[PDB]
Amino acid sequence: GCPPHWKNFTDKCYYFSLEKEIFEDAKLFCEDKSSHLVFINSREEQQWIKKHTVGRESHWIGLTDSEQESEWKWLDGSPVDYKNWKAGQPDNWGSGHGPGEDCAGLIYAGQWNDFQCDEINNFICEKERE
Ligand SMILES: CC(=O)N[C@@H]1[C@@H](O[C@@H]2O[C@@H](C)[C@@H](O)[C@@H](O)[C@@H]2O)[C@H](O[C@@H]2O[C@H](CO)[C@H](O)[C@H](O)[C@H]2O)[C@@H](CO)O[C@H]1O
Ligand SMILES: [Ca+2]
Ligand SMILES: [Ca+2]
Ligand SMILES: [Ca+2]
Ligand SMILES: [Ca+2]
């Protein structure tokens, strides 16, 4: 029920990018597809996503704390509920010389980590099946 290149999970469609881009460019790419950087709302969605992203590349998800440091929300303004940060993260590395890390992404085993938004990562788009 999803366009080619997209994977289905329940009634949603996901795109696991081959493209590598900084956060804002990733956000823009999904918007051009009438989708948004993935919002992970449950352990089941997290697990399904995990199996489609094993590999060395990291994947941007639609979560940031740019508006207010430590206040993580999805792009649609929804406050983070379900969470899967790796222990010790988010650490806002480098805050002493800049804005730190305000963009979230999936790393090993699917855990979340905060990156500087100018880091080049793969990404995941999400949208409704039509
Ligand atoms: C063995 C090692 O240190 N690997 C490096 C990554 O660091 C690990 O993963 C991060 C997410 C933390 O859990 C570290 O404690 C752990 O050692 C390292 O990842 C970067 O770590 C930064 C903190 O030192 C920060 O969290 C950043 O967001 C994260 O990307 C990567 C990239 O520098 O290199 C591995 O070698
Ligand atoms: Ca979702
Ligand atoms: Ca910040
Ligand atoms: Ca931050
Ligand atoms: Ca980090």
From Swiss-Prot:
Binding-site positions, Ca(2+) 1: F39, N41, E45, E126
Record gene name: Colec12
Induction of the gene: Up-regulated in activated microglia and by fibrillar amyloid-beta peptide in activated astrocytes.
Subunit structure of this chain's protein: The extracellular domain forms a stable trimer. The extracellular domain interacts with fibrillar amyloid-beta peptide.
Cystine bridges: C2-C13, C30-C125, C103-C117
Protein name (Swiss-Prot/TrEMBL): Collectin-12
Tissue: Expressed in vascular endothelial cells in the heart, in perivascular macrophage and smooth muscle cells. Expressed in plaques-surrounding reactive astrocytes located in cerebral cortex and hippocampus and in leptomeningeal vessels showing characteristics of cerebral amyloid angiopathy (CAA) in a double transgenic mouse model of Alzheimer disease (at protein level). Strongly expressed in lung. Moderately expressed in heart, skeletal muscle, spleen, liver, brain, colon, testis, stomach and kidney. Expressed in neonatal astrocytes.
Domain C-type lectin: 9-126
Chain's role: Scavenger receptor that displays several functions associated with host defense. Promotes binding and phagocytosis of Gram-positive, Gram-negative bacteria and yeast. Also binds to sialyl Lewis X or a trisaccharide and asialo-orosomucoid (ASOR). Mediates the recognition, internalization and degradation of oxidatively modified low density lipoprotein (oxLDL) by vascular endothelial cells. Binds to several carbohydrates including Gal-type ligands, D-galactose, L- and D-fucose, GalNAc, T and Tn antigens in a calcium-dependent manner and internalizes specifically GalNAc in nurse-like cells.
Residue positions binding Ca(2+) 3: Q89, D91, E101, N113, D114
Subcellular localization(s) per the UniProt record: Membrane
